[PDB]
Design a binder for these strands. Structure first.
Ligand SMILES: COc1c(N2C[C@@H]3CCCN[C@@H]3C2)c(F)cc2c(=O)c(C(=O)O)cn(C3CC3)c12
Ligand SMILES: COc1c(N2C[C@@H]3CCCN[C@@H]3C2)c(F)cc2c(=O)c(C(=O)O)cn(C3CC3)c12
Ligand SMILES: [Mg+2]
Ligand SMILES: [Mg+2]
Ligand SMILES: [Mg+2]
Ligand SMILES: [Mg+2]
Lengths: 487, 247, 487, 245
DNA sequence: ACGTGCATAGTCATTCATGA
DNA sequence: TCATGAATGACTATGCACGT
């Protein structure tokens, strides 16, 4: 029996836990803004074909596929993670298309795994765009049976768009969501002004990203906190819901709350008001009624007493409830396997770097495949020019290898080419099919010329990021929800 | 006659309505936590309350009364209805003049309905006699037209009918997404439940009627009683002719 | 609002439930001895490739696949059904190969879905043997997305082998498990004596099936109950565990129970004895100790007092515990969609009929496929005899449709044949390759003749059942476990 | 000698031997692992206490809250000694306390939470070497004809594979080398032949050298001061690989 | 009154960091 | 003290028929 000192054990064990939680659980990768479970769920769904071009699969099949191949953890918490990615009040840009009961902004829990179906959303399809073209590094899974992606292509700035919140060890992250159209402008600037220093870049990006854009709409009061978050990586952003004062028939002024700040539970909010009333902390309130429905959305009506001023009661609600609540921004993300607090210019720049890498890698993959196909076509064209000879040669051959070796001698071709000729069908000996082979060669040599041009000019590479992202924003970009006002 | 609704002495799972008038109030007794959850969201909280029942209901025909009153799900129903049971039944204290039983379209939904109808007929008969008991008919299909509004069907026939009419009308459907088939209330979201089973302007309700009280007494005892033999001979005798009860 | 009478509703609703439970939940089909959940799990795993020739897949993937395509019910109870099919103390012949903690004969519950892996067993592969050759009717699943089998090929008498227990409405089944080798003998007799009446058949089959064979070994006392079950479809079979009396160095005697009757919980058994003593009604017992382990199996030591007789205490255990307990046999199974209480000769006969159906259908499928290929090959041979013309014709055709229409007219061939010629690779124009096509035609026409011969001879059909079943039994047949003694 | 249950935790699967000197308590992570462990154990000398969920941090949590925790009460009760000033080693019901957790990081984390509970409430158990750590297997090499071998590291895996192949043995490339991702994936037999069979199990005995140095490390790692912990992890994570070099 | 087996998931407690 | 979000599932009750 071996002895071990308690100090040695505690230090090694706790550091190993802390580091894995930090890098591989709680905090998002800066390039795609995803935690491991997110990335693995989405890839699992993607690889299983659970895409928008097919009907919703039972969500159990997504959990099981994730669990069985990529994510060696419990089916329960994995389902929770999948569910969250499908909720429009949680994600600013949902990555999962949920079918069935996925809960509510209140205390209504999601339906069990058995009752719900799910598939990827079109934007999530942009997260995974051309992942099969060697655009990202893959590594073996938890048991080496299959490969999984280390990061997704992420063809829209997901980290800033959907934000992230996570509690790790020794640190935690809390990045708010942002409006896609605003992020794109920042990216477009970063691409045009690719030589700009950090001082200029931060100034430019902050002008275009006006602030967080929450899925729950609401209000942002002040500009200091937003400015701090982008320059420091830390900042306190004051949020508010919207309150509309209505006057009644009998004369009964009432406050109607139709929006709440990000991550405020509707039911807990009403309960807080109700409990702070009978206790004696919110006088002037006469009655609380939840007139909310699926058809009018949130609608909490607060009737106030006749000897009460509406604005006094609203400020009291701002003070003693989450009708006004702050978002503690802490822009923490994993950069190259290291946790980092980043400025807004760093977050954009690092993402742009990733997109350029993806497209250079995509171009290289396509150029390689183009050369291979070109090569095979060059062999076919030789066969067509000597088609009379090609045939008579194969007929008079004992084996296919003897026929093959003969083809090399005749047309001076590779073993890959001769094989491609051998595998050729009589289908393609028709006139238009012979011409199709010719024209196809010409098409590729044109595509090879294009692809080589891409790799030689950083200008075009940046151009591809811009143009492709622009297409994505024109389709999937939406209006701002959170209104920004001053003090 | 008006009674207080719960707002921050009634069942915990009860999602009560706001209206204090029983004549205008409705209790949706729902199968499953998921379905009850969605119903709670898609309802009209003014006049509609939701009571989710979990698991198959205890057979009051077979079980002794003391065991039945100890059952958490029965206590919820009896309490939420307010009336009382047997000799202490008082319709004046009825908290909802519409008691809608909403279960899955599948065979297990049907079974829960028979267990609830047995509870009502044995403990609270006047609710049936006075037409306070209804059966919600859930949808079976949702036809998702490419450009037009989606249509719901409550039978294989209606599905075939709406499909033909739409296609004849020049509408089109994907052959992938296409016609969503519901296998239970739990698969529905809040909106869908509203637009098929809870919206009073489009919902398909059936009012439970009681004609022959003595004959009903016998059928309940045969189907739900402790005598297996009697039940076995009845099922073999009459299952052959279920299709032809309404022909 | 439509009115409905409570009588019409109750009758229609309860009958619909009872009939579905009877035919489609609780009771086994006579041909393969499976309930719908069993059949759907096994096919799901089968179609998923979760076979013994590959490593165990996470069992969550089997549950999810079953749920998503075939069994529209809860993941929880489906997992339970899968776990049961993997327990050696539940099934006499396990159909699922479990990896991990699948529980114990006691109160130790199985591990959760996330922890366990599973795949089909070799015998379960015989349940599904050649299911892909139209050997059984398929119907659309619960949403018409995919097809599922109505019954499995079941190339070994699974109903009798593994038995079945189920509570339906108005009725219930309880079929005990049997030894595969004994059942095989009964089938072999049924095949040879295919003209024998029910009177003779029952006598023969009862002579070969000596009685149930429980996975938990133990003893069967008496022969009346067994005989009743086979002649009536109902019978009470008295079971016993095995008890061996040990003597101690001091001299004190102790009873060691190493086997218990079928479906007796080990933990409940020990607790029952303790509670009776503690209640003071099994005097003569001095101490109860469970010396069981994974390495010695069941081993319950009952030390008795010196003024106690071993057999007196054993007889008391037979009387007041499940050390002796009866199996209430009730041979109820679904026959052609109808529940039927069956005699033993009926159970065998119905199964033999199923096997013959399976093989005639397999033979029919193979004969059709042979004819289709033989007809495509005939077309190719026509092309080779006129190969000079065939090529020049395709070469001299503008499109492929022009080439095809030409091929039909020239060689007097089908459009299916002409297509095959077009689809032919330049490989098969080699000398030796031209010869393969010729020989393959000759090869198949011999197989077509053979297949036609099988369909024409009921003798051969029965022989195939025998010969194929014999192979299975020689592979997977094992010794008897339950010892049969007299009164 | 002390009586075994046949006034202790419900989850405790006690041993049969009434001698603490001969008895062993396996504190196990998870109901599944604890369940199979209960089956593969030697019921004579080995008892199983399954712990469910992350253990409460006694360094952070108030004392009264810790005593309300069902899992802590299970440990304190099953050990019999008592805690803090009311600690009495004479009443120790098991002279061997083996902590058995998954090889993964969450297993490592649970052990640090248990070692903290022990060091703060029942320190003498560590000082007198009653606390051990079972090392679960990482791999199971399933040879086609030969008996299966278990490995406790990537290195040992490569070593046994190399030796076996050199000896002329063979493995399937499908089934092949089973990789354990936790105790829950193991059956009763596997746990016995790797962590509970005393003739082959790999135990590590927790020793306490400098009590004052340990006191500070526990407070830094497990305490409420995040800042101190954050600087410590960034300072020392860089060099964890080289602690035993 | 208990076991059987296929059907009809929410609740319960911790780690971890941060701000109310 | 509570919320956040990924990490570490057993227990609880009915239907149904049948035999001790
Ligand atoms: C809440 O229903 C269930 C109970 N409940 C019955 C009572 C109701 C009130 C709360 N207490 C008990 C708990 C239970 F004990 C077990 C299961 C269960 O195992 C299961 C499954 O899929 O396996 C599915 N359900 C649900 C579909 C109903 C179960
Ligand atoms: C039994 O552990 C859990 C508890 N318990 C922990 C405590 C122990 C004594 C009883 N009370 C609490 C309840 C809980 F409340 C929730 C979950 C849970 O959600 C979960 C998951 O996969 O999502 C996994 N587990 C298990 C893997 C540990 C949970
Ligand atoms: Mg959980
Ligand atoms: Mg249902
Ligand atoms: Mg269950
Ligand atoms: Mg683990």
């Amino acid at each position: 029996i071996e002895p071990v000192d308690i100090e040695q054990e505690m230090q090694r064990s706790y550091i190993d836990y802390a580091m894995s939680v930090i890098v591989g659980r709680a905090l998002p990768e800066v390039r795609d803004g995803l935690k491991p479970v997110h990335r693995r769920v989405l890839y699992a769904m993607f690889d299983s074909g659970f895409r928008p071009d097919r009907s919703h699969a039972k969500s159990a099949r997504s959990v099981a596929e994730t669990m069985g191949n990529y994510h060696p953890h419990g089916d329960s918490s994995i389902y929770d993670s999948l569910v969250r990615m499908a909720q429009p009040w949680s994600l600013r840009y949902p990555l999962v298309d949920g079918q069935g009961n996925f809960g509510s902004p209140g205390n209504d829990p999601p339906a069990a795994m058995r009752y719900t179906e799910a598939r990827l959303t079109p934007l999530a399809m942009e997260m995974l765009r051309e992942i099969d073209e060697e655009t990202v590094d893959f590594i073996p899974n938890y048991d080496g049976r299959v490969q999984e992606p280390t990061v997704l292509p992420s063809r829209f700035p997901n980290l800033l768009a959907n934000g992230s919140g996570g509690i790790a060890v020794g640190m935690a992250t809390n990045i708010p969501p942002h409006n896609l159209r605003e992020l794109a402008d920042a990216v477009f600037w970063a691409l045009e002004n690719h030589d700009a220093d950090e001082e200029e870049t931060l100034a430019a990006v902050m002008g275009r990203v006006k602030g967080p854009d929450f899925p729950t709409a609401g209000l942002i009061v002040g500009s200091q906190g937003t400015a701090d978050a982008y320059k420091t990586g830390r900042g306190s952003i004051r949020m508010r819901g919207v309150v509309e004062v209505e006057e009644d028939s009998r004369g009964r002024t009432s406050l109607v709350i139709t929006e709440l700040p990000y991550q405020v539970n509707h039911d807990n909010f009403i309960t807080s008001i109700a409990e702070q009333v009978r206790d004696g902390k919110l006088a002037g309130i006469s009655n609380i009624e939840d007139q909310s429905s699926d058809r009018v959305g949130l609608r909490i009506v607060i009737e106030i007493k006749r000897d009460a001023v509406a604005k006094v009661v609203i400020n009291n609600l701002y003070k003693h409830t989450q009708l006004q609540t702050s978002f503690g921004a802490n822009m923490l993300a994993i950069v190259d396997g290291v946790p980092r607090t980043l400025r807004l210019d760093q977050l954009i720049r690092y993402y742009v770097d990733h997109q350029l890498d993806v497209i250079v890698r995509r171009t290289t993959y396509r150029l390689r495949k183009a050369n291979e196909r070109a090569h095979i076509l060059r062999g076919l064209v030789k066969a067509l020019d000597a088609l009379d000879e090609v045939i008579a040669l194969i007929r008079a051959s004992e084996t296919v290898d003897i026929a093959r070796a003969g083809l090399i001698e005749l047309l001076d071709i590779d073993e890959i080419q001769a094989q491609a000729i051998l595998d050729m069908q009589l289908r393609r000996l028709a006139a238009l099919e012979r011409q199709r082979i010719i024209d196809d060669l010409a098409k590729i040599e044109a595509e090879i010329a294009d692809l080589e041009d891409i790799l030689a000019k950083p200008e075009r590479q940046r151009g591809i990021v811009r143009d492709e992202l622009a297409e994505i924003v024109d389709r999937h970009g939406d209006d701002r929800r959170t209104r920004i006002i001053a003090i | 006659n008006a009674l207080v609704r719960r707002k921050s002495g009634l069942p915990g799972k009860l999602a009560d309505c706001r209206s204090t008038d029983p004549r205008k109030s409705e209790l949706y007794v729902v199968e499953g936590d998921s379905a009850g959850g969605s119903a709670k969201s898609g309802r009209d909280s003014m006049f509609q309350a939701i009571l989710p029942l979990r698991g198959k209901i205890i057979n009051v025909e077979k079980a002794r009364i003391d065991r039945v009153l100890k059952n958490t799900e029965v206590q919820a129903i009896i309490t939420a209805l307010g009336t009382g049971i047997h000799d202490e039944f008082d319709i004046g204290k009825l908290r909802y003049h519409k008691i809608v039983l909403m279960a899955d379209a599948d065979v297990d939904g049907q079974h829960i309905s028979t267990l609830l109808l047995t509870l009502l007929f044995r403990f609270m008969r006047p609710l049936i006699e006075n037409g306070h008991v209804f059966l919600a008919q859930p949808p079976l299909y949702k036809l998702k037209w490419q450009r037009s509004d989606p249509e719901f069907a409550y039978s294989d026939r209606e599905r075939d009918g709406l499909l033909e009419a739409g296609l004849k009308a020049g509408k089109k459907i994907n052959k992938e997404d296409g016609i969503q088939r519901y296998k239970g209330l739990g698969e529905m979201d809040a909106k869908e439940l509203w637009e098929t089973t809870m919206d009073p302007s489009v919902r398909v309700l059936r009012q439970v009627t009681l004609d022959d009280a003595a004959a009903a007494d016998e059928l309940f005892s045969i189907l739900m009683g402790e005598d297996v033999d009697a039940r076995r001979s009845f099922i073999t005798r009459n299952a052959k002719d279920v299709r032809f009860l309404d022909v």
